[PDB]
DNA sequence: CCCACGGCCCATCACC
DNA sequence: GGTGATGGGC
DNA sequence: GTGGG
């Protein structure tokens, strides 16, 4: 809250270089600097004090500058009352619909809520479910309801085969308060980086969650990763929102480096990577690895916890809660 | 000045 | 029909 | 839009 002013409206101007603009460099630009100023301890008086920092560079520094004076930036002003910029803006809300499919759908004068409805016909299925549960996908979820969650999702895994690990990550293993979805790592022992030992193995776990009707809908479903909608049950009282799950089976053997990197935040990820190169590694979502003297990965290094892969790159241990960058 | 900007799974659509 | 191309998502 | 090169 330090710095929230300007955080919100670099956030927009992100936004609108996505969605609008489809410019995903200067999307992650301004992201890049929203996050810079965020984790910064001193309070901003002026653009080129922010200048100093990394990621935030003249443009934005003008921006700051403008802010200050004004409380507003005309820019955004001029974004706001434009009205295709409008329209593909609030299209992309929607589940299914990007850039490309907002600003097509607008082309044609479909811009709207109901003009999506009127037009269902034009939707793929993903879509289709995106506008269907609208409004419960832009609520959050309260931690308390993530618990609820937690417990069914590791208990019908149990039910399936007990040796399974089931492990929410995401925000929510970041401690939040609230989540935006629900994010699931799953492993299993006949699953490493060495076979395919078991077909079915998200299958399984995919199916049985719908058989005690806890997953609702599906997005997309394929060997290793599933992404759906799934609801908790009511006793007996108003419905509870449908929310958005996300399950990632993962070899059981590359555990730390899923673990690390599902459990985020994104941007962690990319300062991670980052510095993790400048040390001589290369870091993804499977695995650790050293570069040689020519930029050439060698093989994946041992990881047996998530402070090992700190410790290659010489980065102190930060709890999953201080990584909400 | 100029360019690189963590990346891969899954669904669907254009084209043959 | 099978494909390669692309969009959307994480 | 930015910073390294
Ligand atoms: N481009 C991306 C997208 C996601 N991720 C990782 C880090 C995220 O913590 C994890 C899950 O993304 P996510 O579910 O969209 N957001 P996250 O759980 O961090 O916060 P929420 O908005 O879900 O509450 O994937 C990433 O590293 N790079
Ligand atoms: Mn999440
Ligand atoms: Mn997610
Ligand atoms: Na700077
Ligand atoms: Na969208």
Aim: some cysteine.
């Amino acid at each position: 809250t330090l710095n929230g002013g300007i955080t919100d409206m670099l956030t927009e101007l992100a936004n609108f270089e996505k969605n609008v603009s489809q410019a995903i460099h200067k999307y992650n630009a301004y992201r890049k600097a929203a996050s810079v100023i965020a984790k910064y301890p001193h309070k901003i008086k002026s653009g080129a004090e922010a200048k100093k920092l990394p990621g935030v560079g003249t443009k934005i520094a003008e921006k700051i500058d403008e802010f200050l004076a004004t409380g507003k930036l005309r820019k955004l002003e001029k974004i706001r009352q434009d009205d295709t910029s409008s329209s593909i803006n609030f299209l992309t809300r929607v589940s299914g619909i990007g850039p490309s499919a907002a600003r097509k759908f607008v082309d044609e004068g479909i811009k709207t809520l109901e003009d999506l409805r009127k037009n269902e016909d034009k939707l793929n299925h993903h879509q289709r479910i995106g506008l269907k549960y609208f409004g419960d996908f832009e609520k959050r979820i309260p931690r308390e309801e993530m618990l609820q969650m937690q417990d069914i999702v590791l208990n019908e895994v149990k039910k399936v085969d007990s040796e399974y690990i089931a492990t929410v990550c995401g925000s929510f293993r970041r401690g939040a308060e609230s989540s935006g979805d629900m994010d699931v790592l799953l492993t299993h022992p006949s699953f490493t980086s060495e076979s395919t030992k078991q077909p079915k193995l998200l299958h399984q776990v995919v199916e049985q969650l719908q058989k005690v009707h806890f997953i609702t809908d599906t997005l997309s479903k394929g060997e290793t990763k599933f992404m759906g909608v799934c609801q908790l049950p009511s006793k007996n009282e108003k419905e509870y929102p449908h929310r958005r799950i996300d399950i990632r089976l993962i070899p059981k053997d590359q555990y730390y480096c899923g673990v690390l990197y599902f459990t985020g935040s994104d941007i962690f990820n990319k300062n991670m990577r980052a510095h993790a190169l400048e040390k001589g590694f290369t870091i993804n979502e499977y695995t650790i690895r050293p570069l040689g003297v020519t930029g050439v990965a060698g093989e994946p290094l041992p990881v047996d916890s998530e402070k090992d892969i700190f410790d290659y790159i010489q980065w102190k241990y930060r709890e999953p809660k201080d990584r909400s960058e």
